[PDB]
Design a protein around this ligand. Structure first.
Ligand SMILES: O=C1C(O)=C(c2ccccc2)[C@H](O)C(O)=C1c1ccccc1
Length: 130
């Protein structure tokens, strides 16, 4: 399916620490959204476009030692896809946790116009501070 394979190309880019692969599913106008409760670490709110994603990704190593995604379920209807999964998150002190994620994708002409990450920010903060 065409929306799904563009989403997978992006997840593959993340797996391979490959920004070009990540953007290979994103529209230039894409909206990149993370919970407002990550504002304390400078990772909340909306970033715009390919440049905004790079800004976000350049900040992450300031907060975390590592992250690995495991998408598990894809629910699709139209230009919307919701992906449920887990991720391994490593703190700057080497502590590692498995946490849940939901990615809500909005597509058009085969690329993402919006990707929003929704997750338990308290549990995430607890990992960051451990
Ligand atoms: O690129 C990230 C990112 O770096 C993550 C993150 C890091 C720190 C705090 C909150 C989220 C997400 O784990 C993560 O799903 C993404 C991602 C989503 C879709 C395609 C490619 C990558």
């Amino acid at each position: 399916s065409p929306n799904i394979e563009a989403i997978l190309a992006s997840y593959a880019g993340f797996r391979d620490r490959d920004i070009e692969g990540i953007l290979s599913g994103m529209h230039p106008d894409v909206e990149w959204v993370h919970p407002e409760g990550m504002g304390k670490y400078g990772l909340g709110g909306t970033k715009l476009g390919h440049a905004g994603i790079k800004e976000f990704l350049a900040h992450v190593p300031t907060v975390l030692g590592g992250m690995r995604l495991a998408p598990r379920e894809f629910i699709e209807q139209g230009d919307r896809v919701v992906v449920f999964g887990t991720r391994e998150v490593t703190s700057l002190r080497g502590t590692t946790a498995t946490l849940d994620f939901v990615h809500s994708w909005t597509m058009r002409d085969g690329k993402a116009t919006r990707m929003e990450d929704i997750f338990d920010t308290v549990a995430f903060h607890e990992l960051i501070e451990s």
